[PDB]
Design a protein around this nucleic acid. Structure first.
Lengths: 55, 54
DNA sequence: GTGTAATTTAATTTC
DNA sequence: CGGAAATTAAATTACA
């Protein structure tokens, strides 16, 4: 049960609001940049888009 | 779609017998369980996926 | 008590 | 076409 940071959260949000689907070579980039694992990022995307399904 | 327990149990039996499904088996399974052969095909796919993951 | 990460299961796109 | 590998959506389960 991981908890994400603030600096990391703003980045995932920006990357989302630009494109809701992240590119594999972009997602590795983000993943090694923010220090997280590429899996966390994906699951975060899924849980994000959940909010999209709320409208 | 949500599968029943009965359906999961049938799918489970048919898989544990032979891991790869034949056309007459997906027609039969589709016709008894009420599903589409595609639903079933997908089910075998996801099953073998689970076995190779563990 | 809400909010969200992580887990299943059914369905998809691509090689 | 059917199958394998990688993602996605939908619904639920546990930590937060």
């Amino acid at each position: 049960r991981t908890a994400f940071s603030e600096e990391q959260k703003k980045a995932l949000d920006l990357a989302f609001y630009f494109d809701r689907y992240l590119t594999p070579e972009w997602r590795r980039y983000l993943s090694q940049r923010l220090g997280l694992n590429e899996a966390q990022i994906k699951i975060w995307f899924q849980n994000k888009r959940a909010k999209i399904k709320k409208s």
